[PDB]
Amino acid sequence: MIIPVRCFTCGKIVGNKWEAYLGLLQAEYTEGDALDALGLKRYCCRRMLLAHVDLIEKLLNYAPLE
Amino acid sequence: TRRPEIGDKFSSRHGQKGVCGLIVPQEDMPFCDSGICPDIIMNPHGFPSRMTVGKLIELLAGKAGVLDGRFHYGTAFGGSKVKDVCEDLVRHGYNYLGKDYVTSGITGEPLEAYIYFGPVYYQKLKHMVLDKMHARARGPRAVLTRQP
Amino acid sequence: QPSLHKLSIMAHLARVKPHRTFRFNECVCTPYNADFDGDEMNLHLPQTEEAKAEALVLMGTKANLVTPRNGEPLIAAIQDFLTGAYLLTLKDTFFDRAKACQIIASILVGKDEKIKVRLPPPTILKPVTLWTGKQIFSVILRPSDDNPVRANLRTKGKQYCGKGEDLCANDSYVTIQNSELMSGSMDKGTLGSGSKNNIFYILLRDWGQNEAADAMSRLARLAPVYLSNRGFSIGIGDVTPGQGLLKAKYELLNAGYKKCDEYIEALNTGKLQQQPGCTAEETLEALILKELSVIRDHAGSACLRELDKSNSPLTMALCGSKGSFINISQMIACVGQQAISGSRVPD
Amino acid sequence: IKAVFPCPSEPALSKNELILTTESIMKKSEFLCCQDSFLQEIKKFIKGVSEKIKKTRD
Amino acid sequence: AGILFEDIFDVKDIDPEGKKFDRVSRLHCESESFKMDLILDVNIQIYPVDLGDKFRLVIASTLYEDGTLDDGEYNPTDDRPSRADQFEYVMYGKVYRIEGDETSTEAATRLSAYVSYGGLLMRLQGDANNLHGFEVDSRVYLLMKKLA
Amino acid sequence: KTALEMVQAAGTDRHCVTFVLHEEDHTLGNSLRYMIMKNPEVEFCGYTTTHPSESKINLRIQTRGTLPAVEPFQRGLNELMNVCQHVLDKFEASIKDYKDQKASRNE
Amino acid sequence: QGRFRGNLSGKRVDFSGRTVISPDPNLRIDEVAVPVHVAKILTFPEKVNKANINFLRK
Amino acid sequence: KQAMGTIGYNQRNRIDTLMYLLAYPQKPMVKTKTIELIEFEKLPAGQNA
Amino acid sequence: AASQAVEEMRSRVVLGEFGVRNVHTTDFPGNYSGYDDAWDQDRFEKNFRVDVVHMDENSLEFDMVGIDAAIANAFRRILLAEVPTMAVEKVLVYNNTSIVQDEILAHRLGLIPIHADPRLFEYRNQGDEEGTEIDTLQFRLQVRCTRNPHAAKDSSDPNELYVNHKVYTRHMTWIPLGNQADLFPEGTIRPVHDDILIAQLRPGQEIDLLMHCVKGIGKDHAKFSPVATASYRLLPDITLLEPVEGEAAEELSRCFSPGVIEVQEVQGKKVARVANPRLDTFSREIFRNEKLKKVVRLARVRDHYIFSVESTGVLPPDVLVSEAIKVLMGKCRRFLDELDAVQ
Amino acid sequence: GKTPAEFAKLNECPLDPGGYFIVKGVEKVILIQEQLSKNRIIVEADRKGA
Numbered sequence A: 001m002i003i004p005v006r007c008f009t010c011g012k013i014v015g016n017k018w019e020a021y022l023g024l025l026q027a028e029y030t031e032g033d034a035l036d037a038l039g040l041k042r043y044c045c046r047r048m049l050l051a052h053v054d055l056i057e058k059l060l061n062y063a064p065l066e
Numbered sequence B: 001t002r003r004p005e006i007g008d009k010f011s012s013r014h015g016q017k018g019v020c021g022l023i024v025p026q027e028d029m030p031f032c033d034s035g036i037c038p039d040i041i042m043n044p045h046g047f048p049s050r051m052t053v054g055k056l057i058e059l060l061a062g063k064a065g066v067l068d069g070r071f072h073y074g075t076a077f078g079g080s081k082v083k084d085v086c087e088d089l090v091r092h093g094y095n096y097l098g099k100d101y102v103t104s105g106i107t108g109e110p111l112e113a114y115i116y117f118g119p120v121y122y123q124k125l126k127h128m129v130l131d132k133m134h135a136r137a138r139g140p141r142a143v144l145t146r147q148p
Numbered sequence C: 001q002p003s004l005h006k007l008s009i010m011a012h013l014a015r016v017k018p019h020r021t022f023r024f025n026e027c028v029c030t031p032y033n034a035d036f037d038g039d040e041m042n043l044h045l046p047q048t049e050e051a052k053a054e055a056l057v058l059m060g061t062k063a064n065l066v067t068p069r070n071g072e073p074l075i076a077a078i079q080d081f082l083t084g085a086y087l088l089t090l091k092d093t094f095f096d097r098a099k100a101c102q103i104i105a106s107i108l109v110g111k112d113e114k115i116k117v118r119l120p121p122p123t124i125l126k127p128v129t130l131w132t133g134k135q136i137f138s139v140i141l142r143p144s145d146d147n148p149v150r151a152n153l154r155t156k157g158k159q160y161c162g163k164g165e166d167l168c169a170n171d172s173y174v175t176i177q178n179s180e181l182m183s184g185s186m187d188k189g190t191l192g193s194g195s196k197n198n199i200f201y202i203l204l205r206d207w208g209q210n211e212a213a214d215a216m217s218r219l220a221r222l223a224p225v226y227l228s229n230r231g232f233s234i235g236i237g238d239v240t241p242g243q244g245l246l247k248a249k250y251e252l253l254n255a256g257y258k259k260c261d262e263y264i265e266a267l268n269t270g271k272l273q274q275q276p277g278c279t280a281e282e283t284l285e286a287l288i289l290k291e292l293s294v295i296r297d298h299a300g301s302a303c304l305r306e307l308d309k310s311n312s313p314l315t316m317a318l319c320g321s322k323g324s325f326i327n328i329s330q331m332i333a334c335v336g337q338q339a340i341s342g343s344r345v346p347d
Numbered sequence D: 001i002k003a004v005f006p007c008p009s010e011p012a013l014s015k016n017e018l019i020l021t022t023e024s025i026m027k028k029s030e031f032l033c034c035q036d037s038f039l040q041e042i043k044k045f046i047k048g049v050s051e052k053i054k055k056t057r058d
Numbered sequence E: 001a002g003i004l005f006e007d008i009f010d011v012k013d014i015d016p017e018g019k020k021f022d023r024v025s026r027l028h029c030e031s032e033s034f035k036m037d038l039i040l041d042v043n044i045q046i047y048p049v050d051l052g053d054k055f056r057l058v059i060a061s062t063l064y065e066d067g068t069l070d071d072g073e074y075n076p077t078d079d080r081p082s083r084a085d086q087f088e089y090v091m092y093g094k095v096y097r098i099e100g101d102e103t104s105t106e107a108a109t110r111l112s113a114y115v116s117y118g119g120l121l122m123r124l125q126g127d128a129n130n131l132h133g134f135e136v137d138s139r140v141y142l143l144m145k146k147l148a
Numbered sequence F: 001k002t003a004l005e006m007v008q009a010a011g012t013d014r015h016c017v018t019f020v021l022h023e024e025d026h027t028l029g030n031s032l033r034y035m036i037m038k039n040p041e042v043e044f045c046g047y048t049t050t051h052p053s054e055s056k057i058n059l060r061i062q063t064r065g066t067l068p069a070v071e072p073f074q075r076g077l078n079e080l081m082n083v084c085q086h087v088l089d090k091f092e093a094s095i096k097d098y099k100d101q102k103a104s105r106n107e
Numbered sequence G: 001q002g003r004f005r006g007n008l009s010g011k012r013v014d015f016s017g018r019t020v021i022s023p024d025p026n027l028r029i030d031e032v033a034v035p036v037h038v039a040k041i042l043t044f045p046e047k048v049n050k051a052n053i054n055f056l057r058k
Numbered sequence H: 001k002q003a004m005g006t007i008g009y010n011q012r013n014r015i016d017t018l019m020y021l022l023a024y025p026q027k028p029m030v031k032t033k034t035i036e037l038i039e040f041e042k043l044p045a046g047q048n049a
Numbered sequence I: 001a002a003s004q005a006v007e008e009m010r011s012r013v014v015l016g017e018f019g020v021r022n023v024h025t026t027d028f029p030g031n032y033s034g035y036d037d038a039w040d041q042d043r044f045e046k047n048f049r050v051d052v053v054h055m056d057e058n059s060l061e062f063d064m065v066g067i068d069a070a071i072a073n074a075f076r077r078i079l080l081a082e083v084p085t086m087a088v089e090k091v092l093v094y095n096n097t098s099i100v101q102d103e104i105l106a107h108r109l110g111l112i113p114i115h116a117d118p119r120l121f122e123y124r125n126q127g128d129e130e131g132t133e134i135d136t137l138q139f140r141l142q143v144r145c146t147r148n149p150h151a152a153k154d155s156s157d158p159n160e161l162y163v164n165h166k167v168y169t170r171h172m173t174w175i176p177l178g179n180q181a182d183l184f185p186e187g188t189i190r191p192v193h194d195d196i197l198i199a200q201l202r203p204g205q206e207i208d209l210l211m212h213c214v215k216g217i218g219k220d221h222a223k224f225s226p227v228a229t230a231s232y233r234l235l236p237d238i239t240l241l242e243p244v245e246g247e248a249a250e251e252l253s254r255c256f257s258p259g260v261i262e263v264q265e266v267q268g269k270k271v272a273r274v275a276n277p278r279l280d281t282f283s284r285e286i287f288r289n290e291k292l293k294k295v296v297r298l299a300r301v302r303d304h305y306i307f308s309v310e311s312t313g314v315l316p317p318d319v320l321v322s323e324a325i326k327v328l329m330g331k332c333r334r335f336l337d338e339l340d341a342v343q
Numbered sequence J: 001g002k003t004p005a006e007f008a009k010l011n012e013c014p015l016d017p018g019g020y021f022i023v024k025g026v027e028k029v030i031l032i033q034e035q036l037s038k039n040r041i042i043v044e045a046d047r048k049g050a
């Protein structure tokens, strides 16, 4: 749904890297350079951003609101 | 909210379905040189009698995909071969076959054989043990045939 | 639930434990044909002292170690207990005093908590001090000096070359004397649930049910403690074909397809030597199936020769735990003829 | 039985002594409960063992 | 002197059927002073054996030269002058099968003594006059030293 | 409430005793086995977790001579504690030296 | 679902349970580990006698 | 067909008889072209482990 | 010589093409021919040393020489599972009307690292749901999302249309209890990373909850562990058997990590030598090259560890390693005290 | 024919494949029934060999 706070395998805090990751993918980095520039060395941290679907941006269009 | 426990059935996207058996702490797991201690230890006896070599290639191609931000294709009758992902792994400093030097978490001493790490797409199936555990001491009986 | 033979229902002595699953020892998976993939098993608690006693005497696990069908044992070791004992009892393994004490001390639990260990004397003494792994396995059969078990067995292994008589180069002739393993490794044919000359069946017939059950419990306790500190893994480098296979497979396919084409040409536009008892097309089917079986068998005999030892499918096929040589040949060299109902693919 | 009970202080039997002491055991009381076929199979096997002893000592 | 057998041997062949194992090699030897042949397994990691080497082999029932046959348990930690100090490689196993040869039909005197050092076998075959003192289930110390 | 329980063997007077340590695991068990096996009076020493649901280890100690096995257990504990004290002192000295050398450079 | 095939041949029993199985080698081969949430429901009627009065009071 | 996943984007406004969701789904790391055609990577079922 | 094989057997973990050899720790008394491996305190205190090779914020990397595997493994396990920290346990919820469910929101708040220094707090007892000054903190989150009153006609991005549409962790406000306002200065007790996305909102939705941090160890739950990961590797020594000259040195320079094999010129000729073996990861690509399998001997020095402690930011990792050693010292002290209470 | 912005006002998923009825609140699918092709000459064997 939303980005998990910590990586499942090691435990590094990944949940703050998401808004920087989309910001670095607006400036036309590749994913391979963006994950390096955010500083995720172990690949268990890298699959938290490489494989994450952001459903809550598209679930919040359906929430009732005033 | 149901959290996975002893009894909750996972799968593997290759028919290697299997119940969870044991939940060990993080400190008791093996670990590479880089400190990665694996989430799911899978038994290597499932592979020779079932010949799921596709899982061994999925693990390799996923490992070679997370290291440089691609998604490799495993399309039927095509897809990214082994000879490309071997070079993609060797460019980043891992072994070209996925096997890694792995230190045991229990004893601290390294292991004799190398261990085959990689990210495999497991998917949790709906058959949980909290919905299947059932018991009856004595209770309601039928009205007609007085048996449970 | 699908109750095929009479060992689909046995009686165990219950013990309560916190988590939410029925947890039994894996040596009992062969009678139930259970597989731990979400399988459910029913429980029945008898409500009367006569029912308890008849269940405990007639239907206990220790009193039904042998199937009534032919007399071969069913409760025996299974995968990862065979591979653990096979990799424990090679001629290669040697332990210092630290790791040998650490492996032996895994059995000191349960009702074997009160016994004295009897660490056996070391094999090599002067340059280093090394217990050979067969002594560590022999501690299973007799883990104390006052245990009256004296097991004896003398049989052929699986991979026995036929000419050895205890001196084969494979070290595959099992000789246990006074519960001390003197040569040879533990195959499936010495620990597994296959047939007789099982060491647990020897312990059952000569020294009662209790010693067979204690030995199976000690092996199931010990062999994973060795194996999970050895490391035993399989990867794509373990089913990849070498160069010596990729030459021989190409030569075999060219030779077999040439001989098949010459048989096709000998049927359609010439004389084909008809085999006795059949039409000419059935002769052609038999010759083509013979040539394709030669292709599969020679590709298998070429892929097995170039594998290294300590290859994981090869170890799991030599100890008979899971798999066979057909599977290794079929996922390295050449998948054979795909036969539907004993013939080639019908049109 | 040769491995569990080695008696190092006892003399090894010959062929004739083996047949004699085997028949001296098998004519006691408790062996009447067995069938005739089982006694014949025991005496056949003991004769085979005695022939092996004779061939080795020759 | 509780020596059962003491002779000089020469290595004729190191690996007859290929290198089946990493640490153990199947020696095939032959002696000078007698007509003994010797199949032997040694640990070649701790003690390397080459092709034309020539060693002196000793099989003794005890390690103490005064003739003290008391052995309840071996102590590696205790230090005292023993028979092993003159040698470079000391094993310890049990004789388990004395077996007469079958290759001759009458009037032969070759006997085989199979001694198993914890799994590492040894066939000591020769004339029956040399092997006096071997019995089944007696525990012998092999001792061994290369010569110049 | 007692975390240390001593189960002796059946026939042997106090020289083959099994230490049940409550509320530990492989962490103390492996280090304590390492410091006990250095004592040359110990013939056998090794631990085992009884069951992974439970936090126990059974640390069997078998001595050679006539000394009881409580003394190698106590010497193993004290030697492990002195190793940890020395490691703590050397590591804190090395950290203080590293921070001092970095704060002295580029100033 | 008649009387014969439904109720005489094989009939449903109580004092039973049904759970998913999972392996555990640390038990002996004649033991099964029953969960707590089943063993609180399944009961055995133990008659009070002289040998176990102090156990059943607890 | 039994893998827990996400039913759709309306899965919070939807009262069904029995609905299993996964808390943090992830899209697969080795994906087929069929996954790109039927849009399985937009609402997946499973986690890379 | 046999002395070379025995010396290599007890201090070098060699790496084969097919499997690691010599893995066990063997230097124990009575396991070798003429050596004397009894526990000598002075030989350990002479050989042991610590060299810190790198350190910055939230990370550390230091060498240890002479310690054994069964003690360095204990330091790693104490860092993962026994060095206590502070993490949220009770999430008291008033009016959660977002799309993030209440259970998952409480679970996300549990995993957030809190910058309290947990040597100052005590374990909460059994029960005791309120807590006191000593054994808890308290955080209060309250975010209400509304529309931005001025906006353009396009209404495309969410960053312009809404205010507080993302609930970060800078919206967590600390609420003191008792004398914690004077014990702790203003600005220390805070969530650490200060940017972690907790939930995400739309106008009309509101989160107003109240969190109770406690002290806990990593064995109980993984939210209390202070380290991102902490591991160790043995320091390698790639050694050369025969000299590698000519064009073989160029391809040997590519069969390793990019900072271990240097190539230098002596007589207009390139010879290779091992320069910085610490930087190798052991990809073992020297075994694909057929001519070069017999020139190198890849091995790990057994008694030269390289720890690497990356903290989550609760407290800087030198203090983590000091606490990790003191926990094991306390575990030895507890069983010494129980022996003295027995006898 | 609607856009993914206009499925929100109807509370319907854009990836919901469709093709299922809704009767009395449950979603029902008429399965694709397989038949033998009618009006065609089929030469079959009889039980008794004819």
Ligand SMILES: [Mg+2]
Binding pocket: C034, C035, C036, C037, C039
């Ligand atoms: Mg099944």
Ligand SMILES: [Zn+2]
Binding pocket: A007, A008, A009, A010, A011, A012, A042, A043, A044, A045, A046
């Ligand atoms: Zn990670």
